[PDB]
RNA sequence: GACUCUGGCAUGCUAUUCUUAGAGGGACAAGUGGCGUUCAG
């Protein structure tokens, strides 16, 4: 049972927000995780990149926890992804798997020559960055396949990217690095500009702006 | 014989020269130093308490706030004001009293506000202190009914409305000189010495020039016609970010302004006392300074301590190895 | 975003700063769409038009919005001249 | 203001704006508000040029104006000297007000007593109210502010030019936002002078509250 | 049975006790001025409060503020409308090329 | 079940008294008399 308390998810609880786009459109946030079960739901699946446990220092001396790194993704969509620290391991996977689902971010796809049927790869040379990590994402041909390390290679098939050259420096042995860093980069596909968006964008109103007398009632 | 706290605050022993001593129970009542009130209790009662009739309450208030002492005055110094009118209206003629007060006249010096004269130890080509002059040195010193007003905003009224005010000195003043601050933006006076934005405005733009009044009903008022004053020198400075929290300091830009509570430890913000009769068995000449609690730590200081760094300009050199905290 | 058979395929037009022309990313969340009220030209009332504007959040962050914002209404005609 | 001579700046306002000393700004400046400001005289005090107010007041007039839901404006001042003015405002308006300290995570953390979307934010002192501005960049809000000469302008995207030290002159400035927005929705002829007379938006201060119940 | 809940206690009574002087006796006015006033998300909720309220004004006409008349203090002239105002020479200046060049109230003082 | 939603009657608005399906109403213990700590019930 979901009792909405943003006003966003009082809409969306209701059927005045239809897709998720629109959510991105005015770069609102999304703060109850019930929203991305609405909208994608059994789409969701959630691959569990690793779990370390971790000894806290406590004044009782040391006492363990554990640290979870869950990608989630919708596969020809979209992805997220969360780390969270617990005492056992089923509530650190859930926090992170609801950490992850309040990340969820679109990415663009694009074509590596010709543009006939549907986007398989990146649209243009990508980077992201994350402490001394860089992972570069440069568009690839059809069929040619994710090449990559396994944990990029996880978070890029979970995007919906079919086809991708891949390049990292720096220490990609610590995972949360790498990870966040090739999240970075699929963030930044939308946010490249390119001709294909440069016409000039019309304002549509905004949902807290458009439904304002269905908030009235709440 | 109406007396203020100041004479009370004082400890003006002058019961036995007047007979109509009256007051505010508001203005005994709001005293809080413990002497003064063991003080009250060993007196001979002959002073009576009152209230005015509100009437002149207001006629006070509306010459108040023509004369410019408006927002200076409280609202018991008000009441001593209607008191002490009332008191002249019942046993005096009400003819002798003047209204509509007289206009400012103005008239300008090159001596800078600064100048230490009529400070009483200073000397400039003689000036001592004695044993014999400590007593006598009060202020400017110079029938049936008086105040006991110390506050310079209630001599200033009453000697503009033509009221003969005294002092702890029996004889009353004729002869009324002190300081006060006008705003160099919206030129409102204030009679606080301590405050440092402007009422009004609420700049801190507050300078100081001096007053004099009469006892005949003229107030004449001196500028000083020097250039070091009003120049803006450090006056533009680039502010940090401001910053919350629980030790954030601001640089303090408006009066009402809110900061958070950085108190220091009562060990520290205690001084050393020699004229104790406990002093001498005590094991160290000085008190101990405080080291050990957390407000030591974050270096909170006495907020009239470091007052000469405030007045260096922040846009200039300071040493090379030191921290203004 | 557009392929060769014609149709659009892309999951949306991110809307771009009226300052800049920057892309308003899905997650700028200091970025701002503002409406400003159309009046009429006899009364001085409030029409029910309104022109909006977008604002992305690095302009807003360099301080630099209440420029952009006061520039783009003298150039639509909301703020006179002077 | 469109150049339109139905809201073109009357004598009485400028009255109003002398009186009070909104044109008194501080003795510093920011430079990001150096396009507001007449001259500095050699005193020191920077001059605020008013008819840039007119047009930054009329510029959040009509922001203001644009929103359907006048609850979803919300009006703040931490410090007293605007506490009593944007009360007023609210009851002018309808806006949302808070007064006193904002509880940090009003705007962003949902799980809370006083928590709130608003979908426009006035602030008094974009230096004192700092926080809300904060929250702002973090939830989209956009925010007007009533700027001084020393006023950073991360996250304010109208800056009103005023002395916002002075009691009068914020609660002038308050009341003119109330003007100007209610006769610009329409419940107020622009002929008639407002019934509400601006002495009603200053800080009351209760000493000056017992000076006045004394004289009565 | 049937009780009543909480909230509609809490909203009857704030409501009575700031705006007890415009409430009647009658159900359909009272429920209107609270429709008028409260910010009441729900019908069926604004009746019960109507109810509650039409109870409580009931049962005490049968038998058994400071802050709110110092704040809606106003005078009987405001300060700003006054016969002198001192500007300086620099703000005249400015005045005067702001088109304002024809006042009366204006007092320059120069600075000396 | 003191949880959530909701029906009976509309000759009312909407493409409309007989069929429709959206919205707006109407019911709230509201009124009366008894028992009641005279208030909760
Ligand atoms: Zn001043």
């Known amino acids: 049972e979901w009792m909405p308390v943003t006003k966003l998810g009082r809409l969306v609880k209701d059927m005045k927000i239809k897709s998720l786009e629109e959510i991105y459109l005015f770069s609102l946030p999304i703060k109850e995780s019930e929203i991305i079960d609405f909208f994608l739901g059994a789409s969701l699946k959630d691959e569990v990149l690793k779990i370390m446990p971790v000894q806290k220092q406590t004044r009782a001396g040391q006492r363990t926890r554990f640290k979870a790194f869950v990608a989630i993704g919708d596969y020809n969509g979209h992805v997220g992804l969360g780390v969270k620290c617990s005492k056992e391991v089923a509530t650190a996977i859930r926090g992170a798997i609801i950490l992850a689902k309040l990340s969820i971010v679109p990415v663009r796809r694009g074509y590596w020559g010709n543009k006939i049927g549907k986007p398989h790869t990146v649209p243009c040379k990508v980077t992201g960055r994350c402490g001394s990590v860089l992972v570069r994402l440069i568009p690839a041909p059809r069929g040619t396949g994710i090449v990559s390390a396994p944990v990029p290679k996880k978070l890029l098939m979970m995007a919906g990217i079919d086809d991708c050259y891949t390049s990292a420096r720096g220490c990609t042995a610590t995972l949360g690095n790498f990870a966040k860093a090739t999240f970075d980069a699929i963030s930044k596909t939308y946010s490249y500009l390119t001709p294909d968006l440069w016409k000039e964008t019309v304002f549509t109103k905004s949902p807290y702006q458009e439904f304002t007398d269905h908030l009235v009632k709440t | 014989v109406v007396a203020d706290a100041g004479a009370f605050l004082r400890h003006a022993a002058l019961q036995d020269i007047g007979k109509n001593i009256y007051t505010i129970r508001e203005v005994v009542t709001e005293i809080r130093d413990k002497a003064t009130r063991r003080r009250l209790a060993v007196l001979p009662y002959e002073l009576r308490f009152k209230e005015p009739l509100p009437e002149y309450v207001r006629l006070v208030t509306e010459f108040s706030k023509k004369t410019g002492d408006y927002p200076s005055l409280s609202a018991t110094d008000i009441q001593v004001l209607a008191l002490t009118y009332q008191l002249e209206a019942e046993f005096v003629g009400v003819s002798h009293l003047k209204q509509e007060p007289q206009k400012v006249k103005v008239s300008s010096s090159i001596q800078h506000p600064e100048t230490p004269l009529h400070i009483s130890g200073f000397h400039l080509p003689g000036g001592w202190i004695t044993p014999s002059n400590i007593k006598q040195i009060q202020q400017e010193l110079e029938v049936r009914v008086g105040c006991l007003t110390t506050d310079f905003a209630m001599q200033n009224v009453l000697l503009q409305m033509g009221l003969h005010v005294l002092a702890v000195n029996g004889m009353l003043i004729r002869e009324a000189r002190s300081y006060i601050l006008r705003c160099h933006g919206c030129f409102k006076t204030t009679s606080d010495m301590s405050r440092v934005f402007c009422s009004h405005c609420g700049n801190k733009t507050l300078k100081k020039v001096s007053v004099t009044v009469s006892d005949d009903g003229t107030l004449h008022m001196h500028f000083s016609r020097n250039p070091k004053v009003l120049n803006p020198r450090g006056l533009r400075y680039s502010l940090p970010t401001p910053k919350g929290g629980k030790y954030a300091i601001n640089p303090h830009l408006t009066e009402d302004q809110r900061f958070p509570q950085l108190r220091l430890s009562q060990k520290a913000r205690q001084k050393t006392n020699v004229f104790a009769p406990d002093y001498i068995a005590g094991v160290s000449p000085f008190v101990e300074n405080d080291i050990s609690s957390r407000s030591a730590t974050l270096q909170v200081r006495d907020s009239t301590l470091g007052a000469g760094r405030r007045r260096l300009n922040p846009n200039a050199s300071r040493k090379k190895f030191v921290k203004k905290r | 975003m557009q392929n060769d058979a014609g149709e659009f395929v892309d999951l949306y037009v991110p809307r771009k700063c009226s300052a800049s022309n920057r892309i308003i990313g899905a997650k700028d969340h200091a970025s701002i769409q503002m409406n400003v009220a159309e009046v009429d030209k006899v009364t001085g009332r409030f029409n029910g038009q309104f022109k909006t504007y977008a604002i992305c959040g690095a302009i807003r962050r360099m301080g630099e919005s209440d420029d952009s914002i006061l520039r783009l209404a003298k150039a639509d005609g909301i703020v006179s001249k002077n | 203001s469109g150049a339109l001579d139905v809201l073109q700046m009357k004598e009485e306002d400028v009255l109003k704006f002398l009186a009070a000393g909104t044109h008194l700004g501080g003795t510093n400046l920011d430079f990001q508000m150096e396009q507001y400001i007449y001259k500095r005289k050699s005193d020191g005090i920077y001059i605020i040029n008013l008819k840039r107010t007119w047009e930054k007041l009329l510029l959040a007039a009509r922001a203001i104006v644009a929103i359907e839901n006048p609850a979803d404006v919300s009006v703040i001042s931490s410090r007293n000297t605007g506490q009593r003015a944007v009360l007023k405002f609210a009851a002018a308006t309808g806006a949302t007000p808070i007064a006193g300290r904002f509880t940090p995570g009003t705007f962003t953390n949902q799980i809370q007593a006083a928590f709130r979307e608003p979908r426009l934010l006035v602030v008094t002192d974009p230096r004192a109210d700092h926080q809300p501005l904060t929250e702002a960049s973090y939830v989209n809000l956009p925010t007007i502010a009533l700027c001084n000469t020393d006023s950073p302008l991360r996250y304010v995207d109208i800056a009103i030019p005023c002395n916002n030290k002075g009691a009068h002159s914020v609660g002038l400035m308050w009341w003119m936002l109330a003007r100007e927005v209610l006769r610009m929705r329409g419940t107020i002829s622009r002929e008639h002078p407002w019934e509400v007379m601006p002495d009603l938006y200053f800080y009351r201060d209760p000493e000056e509250i017992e000076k006045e119940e004394q004289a009565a | ?112």
Do not use: W
């Open chain 5, 1 to 112: 049975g049937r009780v009543r809940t909480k909230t509609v206690k809490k909203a009857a009574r704030v409501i009575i006790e700031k705006y007890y002087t415009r409430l009647g006796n009658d159900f359909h006015t009272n429920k209107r001025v609270c429709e008028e006033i409260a910010i009441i998300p729900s019908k069926k909720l604004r009746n019960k409060i109507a109810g509650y309220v039409t109870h409580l004004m009931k049962r005490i006409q049968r038998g058994p503020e400071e802050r709110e008349r110092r704040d809606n203090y106003v005078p009987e002239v405001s300060a700003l409308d006054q016969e002198i105002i001192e500007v300086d020479p620099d703000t005249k200046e400015m005045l005067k090329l702001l088109d304002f060049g024809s006042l009366s109230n204006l007092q320059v003082t120069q600075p000396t």
